[PDB]
Amino acid sequence: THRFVQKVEEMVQNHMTYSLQDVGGDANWQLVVEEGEMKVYRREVEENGIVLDPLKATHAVKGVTGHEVCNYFWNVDVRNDWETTIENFHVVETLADNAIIIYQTHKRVWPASQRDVLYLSVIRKIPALTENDPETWIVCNFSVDHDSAPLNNRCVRAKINVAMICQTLVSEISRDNILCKITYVANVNPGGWAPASVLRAVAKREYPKFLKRFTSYVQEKTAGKPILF
Numbered sequence: 402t403h404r405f406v407q408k409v410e411e412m413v414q415n416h417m418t419y420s421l422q423d424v425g426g427d428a429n430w431q432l433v434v435e436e437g438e439m440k441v442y443r444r445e446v447e448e449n450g451i452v453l454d455p456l457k458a459t460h461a462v463k464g465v466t467g468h469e470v471c472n473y474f475w476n477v478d479v480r481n482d483w484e485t486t487i488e489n490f491h492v493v494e495t496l497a498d499n500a501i502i503i504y505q506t507h508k509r510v511w512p513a514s515q516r517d518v519l520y521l522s523v524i525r526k527i528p529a530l531t532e533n534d535p536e537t538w539i540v541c542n543f544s545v546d547h548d549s550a551p552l553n554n555r556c557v558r559a560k561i562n563v564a565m566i567c568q569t570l571v572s573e574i575s576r577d578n579i580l581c582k583i584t585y586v587a588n589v590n591p592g593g594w595a596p597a598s599v600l601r602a603v604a605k606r607e608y609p610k611f612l613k614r615f616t617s618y619v620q621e622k623t624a625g626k627p628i629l630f
């Protein structure tokens with residue numbers, strides 16, 4: 402029990418309530434990119450002339466579990482093996498063995514100024530509501546304030562609320578018979594000002610690239626390892 406336990410529970414619960422819902426029938430979501438099972442949607446939202454566009458994506462990855470996907474997403478030690486848009490990150494504080502606070506800087510995208518982020522990252526297993534329902538693994542990354550926040554005069558502080566939410570279907574169980582269903586949501590306030598066209602182009606390019614790359618890394622690192630359910 403660190404000082405964020407209840408904020409964490411609230412963020413996680415909101416994601417389980419709202420983020421998991423299907424949006425196939427919801428015209429409010431614009432489907433922007435589809436590549437097979439990977440479906441990437443946005444809402445066009447601006448606040449004070451700053452693009453906030455909520456991002457929501459679903460995906461189905463063979464041969465990995467939600468537990469594996471989330472560990473890989475959460476574990477700072479493999480971060481540099483799949484991240485492409487990060488200049489630097491530092492663990493600011495270890496809250497618990499499933500929760501840390503991270504500082505990171507994002508590669509500049511011309512012509513906007515560089516962004517940095519300060520966020521709590523927590524991984525949690527949500528037990529099946531009923532023996533009918535799936536268990537879910539979730540990673541939530543959400544912005545928090547912290548005293549040990551670096552001075553970075555090059556950077557505008559973005560604020561994020563991101564969740565990677567995983568449920569695993571299975572048919573000795575082999576990788577051949579396991580499917581991981583992902584819902585990934587990212588609400589990012591870039592702060593300051595950045596050209597709308599830039600923000601939307603970066604999102605449209607980088608989210609599908611991230612999801613394809615990250616999931617493929619998980620498949621590759623796990624294949625021929627015992628399944629971690």
Ligand SMILES: CCCCCc1ccc(-c2ccc(S(=O)(=O)CCO)cc2)cc1CCc1ccccn1
Nearest residue numbers: 486510513516542559563589591595603604607608
């Ligand atoms: C002018 C560019 C402004 C960049 C704004 C920004 C800042 C941070 C993020 C971002 C994206 C994914 C995460 S995470 O999924 O939690 C994994 C940990 O890194 C945390 C933060 C996103 C974005 C929006 C632009 C953009 C979109 C997808 C990739 C990169 N940049």
